[PDB]
């Protein structure tokens, strides 16, 4: 349905992209967008995207007041967790793989630590330092 | 017919991620939901969002066009920076963002050995 700047992520990969990844709105909660677009760099036969999707992140913490609904960013990362854990079980193995999801793996402790944290000093879903 | 993932968080999880569908090519699932664990007033989940994955390589004939983990590396990554330089900074963040770039550069190495080896789109080792 949608047809083919500041807003474009620039990302670690440079060549050879499939999709272009764009923050959709204004900075909300802490400084941070929380609606993404990833897009094709692909047009259809009349310039449609092959790909537009779109991620909404839960804004305004779970404890605050008048917050909309969404993904954590833990989820995304699991999500990629569980497609390596694959990889690496198939035919297409490879270090670089490995190298990745360790590094996924420990981001993910890092995000539950500060969870923990969080819940810790009661400050879970608080606009809190 | 749960297909729940078992994460790394195990404490007051906002949300539940599942795979959906079979494996695919090199081993894989392409799709996936995420999903709440809070519902509305009706018993509706307050998120259900599904991520489709691209599913066959680029080049071959035959192939769902979707979303590549970079993606949603990037999507986090930029977040976390976000935090970063905003009001409610932490440590924690920083590692986990700093953890998360360092799993970028080693998906890029990917991408850059399958071009060089000239393989990359299509289904090899
Ligand atoms: N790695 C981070 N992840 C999330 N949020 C972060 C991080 N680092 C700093 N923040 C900021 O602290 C607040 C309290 O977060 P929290 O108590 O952990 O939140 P949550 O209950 O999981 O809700 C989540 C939503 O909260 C809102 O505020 C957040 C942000 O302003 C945001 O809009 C969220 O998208
Ligand atoms: N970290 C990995 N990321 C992706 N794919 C991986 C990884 N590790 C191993 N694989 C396997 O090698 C094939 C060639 O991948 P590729 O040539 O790099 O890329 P692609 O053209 O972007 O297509 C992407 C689609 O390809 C299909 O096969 C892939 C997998 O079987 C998959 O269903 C993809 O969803």
């Given at each position: 349905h949608h047809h083919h700047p500041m807003k474009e992520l620039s990302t670690i990969?440079?060549?050879?992209?499939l999709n272009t990844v764009e923050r959709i709105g204004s900075e909300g909660?802490?400084?941070?967008?929380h609606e993404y677009v990833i897009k094709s760099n692909s047009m259809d036969?009349?310039?449609?995207?092959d790909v537009y999707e779109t991620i909404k992140f839960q804004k305004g913490?779970?404890?605050?007041?008048?917050s909309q609904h969404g993904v954590i960013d833990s989820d995304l990362l699991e999500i990629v967790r569980d497609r390596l854990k694959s990889f690496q079980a198939?035919?297409?193995?490879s270090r670089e793989n490995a190298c990745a999801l360790t590094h996924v793996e420990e981001a993910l402790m890092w995000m539950n630590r500060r969870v923990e944290d969080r819940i810790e000093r009661n400050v879970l879903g608080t606009n809190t330092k």
């Open positions: 990969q440079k060549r050879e992209k909660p802490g400084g941070a967008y036969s009349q310039g449609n995207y913490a779970r404890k605050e007041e008048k198939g035919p297409f193995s």
